[PDB]
């Protein structure tokens, strides 16, 4: 991961947490797709399949703001 910075992660936290019901710092995949386009981007279906397969363990799960960005950096802008 060679990009992004401090301020960048900031805007990401507000987004990811914006849909984090538990408010503990974790959101559901269905919510990750939103925070994704909310930051100012818009990948494609194929891009989503790989993005989830790199984190999704089966069907539903609790995503973490950490791994969320720690991986999103593999396909951002």
| 50 in a labelled binding site | no
| 26 in a labelled binding site | yes
Q: Specify the length of the chain in residues.
A: 77
| 64 in a labelled binding site | no
Alpha-carbon distance of 64 to 25, in angstroms, equals: 6
| 8 in a labelled binding site | no
Contacts of 18 (CB under 8 A, 6+ apart): 35, 38
Residues belonging to the binding site for Ca(2+) are: 20, 22, 24, 26, 31, 56, 58, 60, 62, 67
Q: Residues forming the annotated binding site? A: 20, 22, 24, 26, 31, 56, 58, 60, 62, 67
């Amino acid at each position: 991961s060679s990009n992004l910075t401090e301020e960048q992660i900031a805007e990401f936290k507000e987004a990811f947490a914006l849909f984090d019901k538990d408010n503990n710092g974790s959101i559901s995949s269905s919510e990750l797709a939103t925070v994704m386009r909310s930051l100012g981007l818009s990948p494609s279906e194929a891009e989503v399949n790989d993005l989830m397969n790199e984190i999704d363990v089966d069907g539903n799960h609790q995503i973490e703001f950490s791994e969320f960005l720690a991986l999103m950096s593999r396909q951002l802008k």
